[PDB]
Amino acid sequence: AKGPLQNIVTWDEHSLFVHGERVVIFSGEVHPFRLPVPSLYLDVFHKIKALGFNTVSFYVDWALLEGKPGRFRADGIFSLEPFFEAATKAGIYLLARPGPYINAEVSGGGFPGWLQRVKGKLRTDAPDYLHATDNYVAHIASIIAKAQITNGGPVILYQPENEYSGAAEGVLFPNKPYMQYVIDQARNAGIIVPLINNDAFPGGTGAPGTGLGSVDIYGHDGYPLGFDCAHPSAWPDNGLPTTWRQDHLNISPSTPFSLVEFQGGAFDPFGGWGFEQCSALVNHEFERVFYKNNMAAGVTIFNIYMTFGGTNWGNLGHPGGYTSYDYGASIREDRRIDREKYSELKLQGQFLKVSPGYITATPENATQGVYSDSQNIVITPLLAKESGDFFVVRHANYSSTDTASYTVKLPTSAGDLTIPQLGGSLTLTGRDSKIHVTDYPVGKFTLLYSTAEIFTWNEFAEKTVLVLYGGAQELHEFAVKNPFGSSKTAKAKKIEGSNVTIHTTSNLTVVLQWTASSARQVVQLGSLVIYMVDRNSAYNYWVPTLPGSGKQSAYGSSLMNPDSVIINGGYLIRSVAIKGNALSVQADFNVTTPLEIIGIPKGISKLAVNGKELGYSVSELGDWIAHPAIEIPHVQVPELTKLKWYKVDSLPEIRSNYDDSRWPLANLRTSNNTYAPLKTPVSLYGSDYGFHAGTLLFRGRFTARTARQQLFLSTQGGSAFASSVWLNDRFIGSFTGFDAASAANSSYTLDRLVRGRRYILTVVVDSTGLDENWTTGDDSMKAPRGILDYALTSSSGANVSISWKLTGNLGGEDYRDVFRGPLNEGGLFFERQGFHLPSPPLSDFTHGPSSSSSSSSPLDGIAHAGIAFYAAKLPLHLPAQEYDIPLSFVFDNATAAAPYRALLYVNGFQYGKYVSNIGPQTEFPVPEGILDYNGDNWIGVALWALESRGAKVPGLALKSKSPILTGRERVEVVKGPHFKKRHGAY
Ligand SMILES: *[C@@H]1O[C@H](CO)[C@@H](O[C@@H]2O[C@H](CO)[C@@H](O[C@@H]3O[C@H](CO[C@H]4O[C@H](CO[C@H]5O[C@H](CO)[C@@H](O)[C@H](O)[C@@H]5O)[C@@H](O)[C@H](O[C@H]5O[C@H](CO)[C@@H](O)[C@H](O)[C@@H]5O)[C@@H]4O)[C@@H](O)[C@H](O[C@H]4O[C@H](CO)[C@@H](O)[C@H](O)[C@@H]4O[C@H]4O[C@H](CO)[C@@H](O)[C@H](O)[C@@H]4O[C@H]4O[C@H](CO)[C@@H](O)[C@H](O[C@H]5O[C@H](CO)[C@@H](O)[C@H](O)[C@H]5O)[C@@H]4O)[C@@H]3O)[C@H](O)[C@H]2NC(C)=O)[C@H](O)[C@H]1NC(C)=O
Ligand SMILES: *[C@@H]1O[C@H](CO)[C@@H](O[C@@H]2O[C@H](CO)[C@@H](O[C@@H]3O[C@H](CO[C@H]4O[C@H](CO)[C@@H](O)[C@H](O[C@H]5O[C@H](CO)[C@@H](O)[C@H](O)[C@@H]5O[C@H]5O[C@H](CO)[C@@H](O)[C@H](O)[C@@H]5O)[C@@H]4O)[C@@H](O)[C@H](O[C@H]4O[C@H](CO)[C@@H](O)[C@H](O)[C@@H]4O)[C@@H]3O)[C@H](O)[C@H]2NC(C)=O)[C@H](O)[C@H]1NC(C)=O
Ligand SMILES: *[C@@H]1O[C@H](CO)[C@@H](O[C@@H]2O[C@H](CO)[C@@H](O)[C@H](O)[C@H]2NC(C)=O)[C@H](O)[C@H]1NC(C)=O
Ligand SMILES: *[C@@H]1O[C@H](CO)[C@@H](O)[C@H](O)[C@H]1NC(C)=O
Ligand SMILES: *[C@@H]1O[C@H](CO)[C@@H](O)[C@H](O)[C@H]1NC(C)=O
Ligand SMILES: OC[C@H]1O[C@@H](O)[C@H](O)[C@@H](O)[C@H]1O
Structure with a gap:
């Protein structure tokens, strides 16, 4: 440094x-x-x-x-x-x-x-x-x-x-x-x-x-x-x-x-x-x-x-x-x-x-009973000679959900004052904290003090506006140093509300008390206008900045106290701009509301919201009240259960005819992994062979020595992984996973073997990702994925050798989908083939009527352990130009239902790993841009049934949130490549 x-x-x-x-x-x-x-x-x-x-x-x-x-x-x-x-x-x-x-x-x-x-x-x-x-x-x-x-x-x-x-x-x-x-x-x-x-x-x-x-x-x-x-x-x-x-x-x-x-x-x-x-x-x-x-x-x-x-x-x-x-x-x-x-x-x-x-005030130690007579609140001061003080008030027990009544005694340029000066108590409700201020500058005006909290203020060309708030039913008080300048006759004017009281001292300090509620109070003191609102009203105010010029125009006139417009109303105000004599606002609306514009730039007389001009009412203070059209439509989404679902077997490995001659050999006799020294004769760690993402598979060949053999198999996939094992086409078993298990030791009997015959174990091991490495020196990210150890023994106890092949995503670090990146695909058959990509080769899938014996829908699923992949075209035609309509895919979780894992794909992007027996996620949002809201989409669901009785998705639906009328910039559809037959795939 x-x-x-x-x-x-x-x-x-x-x-x-x-x-x-x-x-x-x-x-x-x-x-x-x-x-x-x-x-x-x-x-x-x-x-x-x-x-x-x-x-x-x-x-x-x-x-x-x-x-x-x-x-x-x-x-x-x-x-x-x-x-x-x-x-x-x-x-x-x-x-x-x-x-x-x-x-x-x-x-x-x-x-x-x-x-x-x-x-x-x-x-x-x-x-x-x-x-x-x-x-x-x-x-x-x-x-x-x-x-x-x-x-x-x-x-x-x-x-x-x-x-x-x-x-x-x-x-x-x-x-x-x-x-x-x-x-x-x-x-x-x-x-x-x-x-x-x-x-x-x-x-x-x-x-x-x-x-x-x-x-x-x-x-x-x-x-x-x-x-x-x-x-x-x-x-x-x-x-x-x-x-x-x-x-x-x-x-x-x-x-x-x-x-x-x-x-x-x-x-x-x-x-x-x-x-x-x-x-x-x-x-x-x-x-x-x-x-x-x-x-x-x-x-x-x-x-x-x-x-x-x-x-x-x-x-x-x-x-x-x-x-x-x-x-x-x-x-x-x-x-x-x-x-x-x-x-x-x-x-x-x-x-x-x-x-x-606040920047130049000096924070001091927390106090109790110093800035208030009450000991039930703690007050931390930030102090300055002249540029203003801040006092952070909280319950002495910070967790407290009790309401406390209190007063404060605060230093000000007028001496130490117990506030409220006009009587009454302040309130701190449960789990609230407030900042009270003294000698707080508001442009040319000064708040000698305020208990109410500041939302914003600005000095416009002709008036200064200050917005103060309190929680509902809180009494607040503030005092403004002589706001009238030379004038002896000038007086405060009550513009809105019947609750605010006003008292003036001999040196023309104006002291205002009010009790916050849904009814705004507004008082004008000379050219200062104070808007006094409750917290829930202040939630709907916005302070967009006025643009400067040139490349950095959006950074406005300064970072602190920028030129701005204050807007009351709307679910979001994104921006304002001046265009000739028009103020143009970009806004989003999730409910109907009026819009009130406070602080109109000089010479502006027209208003536009989301590109649409509209008129407005003018208040006696020069604020504009406008009523933009806000139609919130009913949205109809396609029913997923009614799409035309195509199916493909994504575990062809376990069939007698399967050729694995293209698979990588797992033949590395040593590993550089210093965190998990090899226990096996060859490395069975995915990352040793370039596979870092998603599900892995292993194929172990052995020759049967005795009719019954015993397999010990130690797998590791990260927290909440699972692993399933077949011997040829015979399902042996699964470790079905739980939140606290990142590895498992499984023992299986391999029975009824023909001595001398070759058999192939297929072992599927999911990975839920690589671990973090948050403690330097402890190489925890190097925890491998795959098979940590195994032993295959004959019924007389002799050790039986297994020779291995493995795969993760096709190509490993020479991964196939440059557009969607190195982690998107795992190693399951349908991912290696690219069958999750848009416009898959439907001649390689099967289609049959739902709830029939030849169903090709994920809602009917499979009747044995295994893995199937389902794809369907989902056309969407939604008014995305005018509305932001968030979409999500929802799986129904059936209490009594066999365990399964699923993968969700949308236009080739994997956007969900669903684990029916572990959770918690059932609703999978996918953003507009990945989804095409005016075009064809391709959805994919992989279904991995963990148990011998199979599995199915009990329910799967598209869900929309309430549509938001939007002034955002348009969302462009992300153009992921479509399926193309992959050379060298397996
Ligand atoms: C669809 O609906 C389904 C229902 O119809 C629904 O299924 C249900 O899902 C639940 C959630 O997954 C399942 O509950 C969990 O089950 C877990 C597995 O329990 C079995 O195995 C365990 C452990 O066995 C090992 O260890 C033993 C040594 O003690 C040894 O004996 C074993 O052999 C083995 O080695 C057994 O202990 C269980 O036995 C108990 O319960 C059974 C009943 O099944 C009884 O018969 C037994 O008598 C015994 O009581 C059981 O066999 C289990 O691990 C889960 O435990 C957590 O949750 C409960 C709190 O609810 C808590 O008591 C427990 O201590 C565990 O708490 C951790 O997790 C919670 C939740 O996150 C935390 O709040 C808590 O602090 C603990 O967090 C720590 O550990 C977490 C891992 O467990 C870890 O993630 C976490 O990490 C991270 O978080 C912290 C912050 O919290 C960070 O700071 C940290 O950095 C970070 O890493 C942290 O370390 C739980 O019980 C339920 O079984 C299942 N129900 C059914 C009927 O199937 C399904 O989910 C749903 N699907 C969808 C899509 O929604
Ligand atoms: C359109 O978009 C708008 C946003 O622009 C969305 O509006 C938001 O909607 C959410 C969801 O409904 C709202 O959040 C939830 O608010 C409820 C209601 O409580 C709030 O409003 C009432 C007034 O109506 C206030 O009285 C509440 O404040 C009191 O209670 C809270 C504790 O809840 C306390 O902290 C406050 O200090 C205050 O206490 C005072 O009054 C109580 C009397 O009740 C008194 O006992 C106490 O002494 C004090 O005097 C509060 O502001 C709230 O119940 C929900 O909270 C619960 O759930 C969440 C988890 O979700 C937990 O975090 C929480 O602990 C509770 O368990 C939510 O907070 C949000 O306010 C609202 N925002 C705006 C700006 O309107 C619309 O939903 C969108 N609409 C559509 C269709 O899209
Ligand atoms: C601080 O205040 C909190 C919140 O009001 C107290 O929290 C309660 O503590 C008791 C006893 O532990 C529980 O029975 C309540 O359910 C808690 N309430 C909540 C909302 O969490 C807390 O005990 C107080 N602490 C001290 C140290 O005095
Ligand atoms: C181990 O590291 C070196 C780089 O030093 C590399 O050349 C060699 O292939 C690596 N071996 C294994 C088994 O990963
Ligand atoms: C598996 O067994 C070995 C001993 O063979 C033990 O070191 C390891 O902790 C066990 N792993 C799990 C996940 O129980
Ligand atoms: O969400 C917890 C966060 O914890 C911080 O300690 C860490 O720097 C972040 O990267 C993230 O892990």
């Missing part, structure tokens, strides 16, 4: 500066590889920008970009270019976090499975690991360097590594040569923005002043409620972090207090609780208590992980999770922003970006 390398993004003790302007960085995490629809990135950025955020933080997943060692590819759906372009178009800056290690609940934690063949310890300066990362970092850091703000792009900060925070027993930590090598790779590729790290806790690793390996700005993370969503109402004792201001001053006082990841939801494992339950744990109450507690410590770089989670499509996730990565986030997996936590988070983002005094 030796200071800034450029003068665009700089920093000091208090904050980042961007173009010389101090700013609170309030960022949301988004992972581009979890939404492979380039035209929808702007949709996510619009929804994040509307929170009042200015930045997005993103990972890059190395395993998707260098599936074959030496061949970096980030094209098409893997290009970052549309992601950078969308950030520029939305006016969002970026924090780039490319790893190489990212964790992220992705397969391998970002490490490609070919790292299992690297002997040295991962995330150390073992040179085989270091050099294995060089090609990826040189490529990805050069792409991120071109997108730096110094070159007119959105990237302002770069994180090397990820939570490099501890190591296994006996491993050098911190390994400063290692850390510096990772920094040098990024510097050498042209990264000149500041480097920020993300220590897992305040451990000081990499902080400025620690010499070799130090970054520019020390950051750390926090997930104070953990990841088990079993008890969403339980906030345990000592869950609230209370030491971070002191920890910051102990570790890195010279740089801004930065929380590079702070909890925005939870991940959820197979057999977990579902993301609805995670969203109930990390809900709006969690945000108001925990996020304002971070403001109590003076956080000025603050990123919410996740803000939009997306989907672990195409096997990109790790075994510790399942297909969905909704994460319980503020923005759902299907991009809807209906959760209450979204609206609450908007209140907070909109408050910080008009409050520059």
Whole structure:
């Protein structure tokens, strides 16, 4: 660490500066590889920008970009270019976090499975690991360097590594040569923005002043409620972090207090609780208590992980999770922003970006009984000589769901005052926290104090507008220093409401009290207009910024206190623009509502919403009230059970006629896998042969020595995997899996054999992905997939040799579908043939009537253990130009039903792994763009019946959410290649 390398993004003790302007960085995490629809990135950025955020933080997943060692590819759906372009178009800056290690609940934690063949310890300066990362970092850091703000792009900060925070027993930590090598790779590729790290806790690793390996700005993370969503109402004792201001001053006082990841939801494992339950744990109450507690410590770089989670499509996730990565986030997996936590988070983002005094106020210790007579609340002050103070109030027991009545005694430029000055008590309801302010500037006006919280304010050309809110039935008070200027006659004017009271002191300080409710109060004091609303009303206000000009127009006039228009109403306001004498608004509506426009730019007289001009009513304050057309149609979707389903056997391996002469031989007598030394005479680890993704198969030939033989078989597929075994065409058994099992030891009898005859075992082993490697020195990502051990013995105990072949996805690291990437396909027959791709060769399938003996539908399934693949054309003709209509595939889970696993494919993209006996996921969203809403789609369902009685899908339906009338940019259909016969397939 030796200071800034450029003068665009700089920093000091208090904050980042961007173009010389101090700013609170309030960022949301988004992972581009979890939404492979380039035209929808702007949709996510619009929804994040509307929170009042200015930045997005993103990972890059190395395993998707260098599936074959030496061949970096980030094209098409893997290009970052549309992601950078969308950030520029939305006016969002970026924090780039490319790893190489990212964790992220992705397969391998970002490490490609070919790292299992690297002997040295991962995330150390073992040179085989270091050099294995060089090609990826040189490529990805050069792409991120071109997108730096110094070159007119959105990237302002770069994180090397990820939570490099501890190591296994006996491993050098911190390994400063290692850390510096990772920094040098990024510097050498042209990264000149500041480097920020993300220590897992305040451990000081990499902080400025620690010499070799130090970054520019020390950051750390926090997930104070953990990841088990079993008890969403339980906030345990000592869950609230209370030491971070002191920890910051102990570790890195010279740089801004930065929380590079702070909890925005939870991940959820197979057999977990579902993301609805995670969203109930990390809900709006969690945000108001925990996020304002971070403001109590003076956080000025603050990123919410996740803000939009997306989907672990195409096997990109790790075994510790399942297909969905909704994460319980503020923005759902299907991009809807209906959760209450979204609206609450908007209140907070909109408050910080008009409050520059928060940056320079000094956070002090938490107090009890100092700023209030009551001991039942804790108050943390942020103090300044003149530029305004902030007081974060919470229950003394942070978990409390009780209501507390209280008053405060706060320092102000007029002396210490017990507030309310006009009598009455303030209320703090259950799991709420508030920020009260003193000497808070509102343009040329000053709030001497306010108990009500600020949503926004702006100084328009002719009036200043301030929007204050409280929870319903809370009494609030604020005081405005003489707002009348010279004038002796000027008086307050009550514009709306009958609850607000007004008292003026001798020196013309105006003191207003009101009780928040559904009925807005509005008072005008000179050219200041204050709108006093309840929290639930404030949830529907929006503060789009007015564009500047040129390439960076979307970043507006400044990052703090930008020129804006205030809009009351709508499910989302995406943007405003001025076009001659017209204000043009892009908006989404999920329910009917009027739109009220507050702060009309000078000389504007026309209004348009989503490209349609409309009239409006004008209020006595000059606000516009408009009534755009909002038709929310009934949506009819095709019934899936009625499509024309085609079937193909996807376990032809077990038939007598099967030829496996094209399969790879599993003949490697040694392995470079140092984490799991071989127990078998040859390696049976998929990654040793280039297979890192999805289901594996093994074929073991032996000659029977005795009529009965005993097979011990140890398989490993990651958490919630399963494995099935046939002897020739005879089903032997399955390990049917459970959440807590990543491996299994199975013992089977192989009976009624003809001595001297050759037999072939077919062993199918699913993989739910590669493990993470979160503790440096413990090479956990190298846990192999396949067969860990076996023994075949004759009835007299003699050992019987087996010789082996194996496959994963066809071609392995020479994977066949460059467009959809290296992980999308596993090794099942129908995937190797490309039969999951659009327009499959129907002459290779069978069709027959449903509920008949020759049925070709997944609803009838199969009557024996095995694997079938089903495909059908699904035409859709939905009004996607005008409406955002989220679609999902729903499996019915039948309580008494034989176990099965299924794979869901949509236009060749795998968009679901369904595990009927483990769960929890039954509803699989797929985005518009992957689905074609005005065209033919191809759906695929693989059905793997685990038990001898077979299996079927009890029910499968397309589900739509309520249609949202939308002002988004149009979604382009992603053009995945259609089926083409594959040469050399097997
Ligand atoms: C369609 O509907 C179906 C219903 O009709 C539905 O099926 C049901 O699915 C459920 C969910 O999958 C099944 O429940 C689970 O069953 C699991 C398997 O239980 C069998 O095997 C176990 C273990 O056996 C091994 O270990 C033993 C040594 O102790 C040894 O004895 C064994 O030989 C073997 O080696 C047995 O223990 C079970 O026995 C008990 O129960 C049976 C009844 O079947 C009794 O007969 C016995 O007397 C005995 O009581 C059983 O044989 C089981 O593992 C699951 O346990 C978890 O859940 C319960 C809480 O509900 C909890 O008590 C238990 O401690 C386990 O808790 C973990 O998981 C929960 C949920 O996520 C967490 O909240 C909790 O904290 C624990 O989390 C930890 O462990 C997790 C792995 O278990 C791991 O994922 C997790 O990791 C991650 O999370 C944390 C955050 O939480 C992160 O911080 C961490 O980083 C991260 O890794 C964490 O480490 C559970 O009981 C149910 O059986 C099944 N029902 C039926 C009728 O079939 C189906 O799902 C549905 N389908 C769809 C699509 O929805
Ligand atoms: C169109 O899109 C819009 C968004 O623009 C969507 O609207 C959102 O819809 C969701 C889903 O319905 C709403 O979230 C759920 O809200 C309910 C209702 O509670 C809210 O509104 C009522 C007023 O109607 C408030 O009184 C509630 O606030 C009180 O209770 C909460 C605790 O729930 C507490 O935190 C507050 O401080 C407040 O307490 C005060 O009053 C109570 C009296 O009840 C009193 O006891 C206390 O002392 C205080 O005085 C609240 O704002 C809520 O029940 C649901 O929560 C439950 O489930 C979630 C999990 O899903 C858990 O996290 C939670 O803990 C509960 O168990 C949801 O929060 C959301 O508010 C709403 N947003 C907006 C802007 O309207 C539409 O749904 C979309 N429509 C369509 C068709 O698409
Ligand atoms: C802090 O307040 C919380 C929330 O009101 C208390 O939580 C309750 O704790 C008791 C005993 O553990 C449980 O029976 C309740 O069910 C809890 N309620 C909820 C909503 O979780 C908590 O005990 C208080 N803690 C301290 C240390 O005084
Ligand atoms: C082990 O590593 C070296 C690279 O050092 C490679 O040439 C060799 O093929 C690898 N062997 C196996 C069995 O993976
Ligand atoms: C399988 O058995 C071996 C001993 O052969 C043991 O080391 C291993 O832990 C067992 N694995 C599982 C998943 O039980
Ligand atoms: O969702 C849990 C998160 O935990 C953080 O500790 C980690 O840096 C992230 O990559 C992600 O794993």
